[PDB]
């Protein structure tokens, strides 16, 4: 089997419907006969009993610890994964056709392929699919720096400002092998993105790809995007 979908829960079903139901339904629509779901334990370690009350074909719910991250979540399920990893989240309701990111993962044999939908400044090549840079001022002392080798190999890099991460990744086996071999990573969204973006700027190397959609948008953990979730689910869940 090509993919093993992993759904993260780090601080949940507060809305017109369950927040866990939309990612699982999206997964169970196109394939994904077995789904590994990670339960939450930071806010309350009792949502897994709320996770086993759905009507899906097959779910794998595991208990987790309170103080844990997404990189620790992937390092926790390392002896039970044997193929590529397709990471998800709970608060992510997307009307985007999922097969674009998987087509970019298969067609170019990328090492990581991600999906964004219109803070974090990203630079993607003129083809629009392969990314080259991403940074925020949370960890930047200086304003912005660009490596010289990526300007010698890619002379024009289109930057984007309003793009937010929908947290839909496509990891390979050796990426999770290096993540398990390097226990200094705690948040995989800031670790697997920036370290692989730096290591791709080396010939024989790795490929990172991204799809910028223009159909819908994801949500957030806070109450800033909790008002549009019901308006999205009232007009987008009728077709699903």
């Amino acid at each position: 089997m090509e993919f093993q979908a992993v759904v993260m829960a780090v601080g949940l079903p507060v809305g017109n419907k369950p927040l866990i139901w939309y990612p699982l339904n999206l997964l169970e629509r196109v394939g994904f006969e077995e789904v590994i779901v990670v339960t939450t334990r930071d806010v309350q370690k009792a949502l897994c009993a709320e996770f086993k009350m759905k009507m899906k074909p097959d779910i794998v719910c595991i208990p987790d610890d309170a103080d844990m991250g997404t990189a620790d979540s992937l390092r926790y399920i390392y002896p039970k994964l044997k193929t590529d990893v397709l990471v998800l989240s709970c608060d992510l309701i997307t009307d985007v056709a999922l097969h674009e990111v998987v087509d970019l993962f298969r067609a170019y044999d990328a090492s990581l392929a991600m999906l964004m939908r219109k803070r974090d400044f990203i630079g993607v090549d003129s083809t629009g699919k392969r990314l080259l840079f991403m940074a925020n001022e949370a960890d930047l002392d200086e304003e912005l720096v660009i490596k010289g080798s990526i300007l010698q190999k890619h002379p024009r890099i289109r930057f984007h400002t309003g793009l937010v991460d929908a947290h839909l990744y496509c990891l390979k086996k050796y990426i999770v092998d290096f993540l398990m071999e390097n226990g200094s990573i705690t948040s995989i969204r800031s670790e697997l993105i920036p370290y692989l973006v730096r290591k791709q700027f080396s010939l024989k190397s790795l490929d990172i790809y991204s799809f910028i959609k223009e159909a819908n948008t994801l949500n957030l953990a806070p109450y800033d995007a909790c008002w549009n979730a019901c308006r999205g689910d009232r007009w987008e869940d009728l077709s699903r």
């Binding site: 089997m1 090509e2 993919f3 196109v30 994904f32 397709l86 097969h99 298969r106 067609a107």
Partner: protein
């Protein structure tokens, strides 16, 4: 199951039986993300073939055999079934999917035939993984000899033909002709190569970069100006994709045209082809068996008035880009295989000594 792709645009009336797909269209819109009907390596090969990332014939066959190695490595045997029948019954939807993504090369057809003859020759008294490792080693030995030993033999047979002070014409992108020119430049011959290119692939820049990085003085030209350079050109070297039983040369589309202008300027034609790219199938024109690419590839941006952008508004407008064409067998002089220098008249005859007879 797999549906049939939507054929794009308005087809030519002479090309009504041949399919015409698009690259913005892909087959995996209605397929599973863990691919269960098609293998993951097979759908990865189909996506690498449909988008045009793997266009050379040897590269297509090598990636096909690597995907077949990953299929055999990820193969299981159901109860009360034999391998020699279930494998040919399961590989046919894979090859149908690969044909649906892009019309297959003849090297891929001969690889399919050789693999079917190999996995038919497996006895059921053998084990599962023993026969799987035997077939993987057979695929490895097959691609090993009929890529690198054939390439080294054709390069050695072309090194004793190219003289000093010669000027060589090439067309398209081929690994064999580029390896011949690189080994001839490194082994002592001093020459310069004229590169002929054509729209809309523009794949002559690949062998142009292969010739400049080798240190060879190059000349980049197009197909209408080749008639300007053929009075200067002493020898024409070409990369063949398939050779047919009448002696026709199926390759990129500007081959028989270029060979006719080369014969009109008395310049001999030297196609370079391996013995596994032969065919018992034969055709006499570029109309009964050919690949049709995207109709939106012919458009260009010459200023501000791209005219073939909304070509579908005109009902009496047809767009066409032929990929393969055949040559008359009286136009091509040399056929350089690993068995030596033959004419085109010995294309099926070598097949007779490659059919275990």
């Amino acid at each position: 199951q797999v549906p049939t792709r939507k054929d794009y645009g308005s087809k030519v009336s002479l090309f009504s039986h041949l399919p015409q797909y698009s690259r913005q269209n892909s087959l995996t819109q209605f397929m599973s993300i863990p691919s269960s009907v098609i293998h993951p390596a097979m759908v990865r090969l189909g996506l690498q073939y449909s988008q045009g990332l793997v266009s050379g014939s040897n590269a297509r066959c090598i990636a096909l055999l690597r995907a077949l190695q990953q299929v055999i490595q990820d193969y299981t045997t159901p109860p009360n079934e034999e391998l020699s029948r279930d494998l040919v019954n399961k590989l046919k939807p894979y090859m149908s999917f690969l044909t649906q993504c892009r019309p297959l090369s003849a090297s891929m057809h001969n690889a399919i035939k050789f693999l079917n003859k190999e996995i038919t020759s497996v006895g059921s008294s053998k084990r599962e993984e023993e026969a799987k490792s035997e077939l993987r080693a057979a695929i490895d030995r097959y691609v090993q000899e009929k890529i690198v030993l054939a390439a080294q033999a054709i390069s050695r047979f072309a090194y004793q033909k190219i003289s000093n002070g010669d000027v060589i014409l090439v067309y398209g992108c081929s690994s064999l002709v580029s390896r011949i020119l690189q080994e001839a430049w490194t082994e002592g011959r001093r020459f310069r190569v004229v590169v002929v290119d054509s729209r809309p692939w523009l794949e002559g820049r690949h062998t142009l970069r292969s010739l400049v990085h080798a240190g060879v003085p190059a000349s980049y030209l197009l197909i209408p100006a080749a008639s300007y350079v053929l009075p200067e050109v002493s020898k024409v070297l070409l990369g063949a994709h398939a050779l047919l039983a009448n002696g026709s040369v199926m390759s990129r589309v500007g081959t028989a045209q270029l060979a006719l202008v080369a014969r009109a300027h008395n310049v001999p034609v030297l196609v370079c082809c391996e013995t596994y790219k032969f065919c018992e199938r034969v055709q006499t024109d570029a109309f009964v068996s050919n690949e049709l690419d995207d109709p939106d590839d012919l458009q260009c941006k010459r200023g501000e008035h791209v005219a073939l952008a909304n070509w579908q508004n005109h009902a009496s407008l047809r767009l066409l880009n032929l990929v393969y064409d055949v040559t008359p067998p009286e136009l091509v002089d040399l056929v350089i295989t690993e068995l030596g220098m033959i004419p085109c008249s010995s294309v099926p005859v070598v097949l007779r000594v490659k059919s275990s007879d």
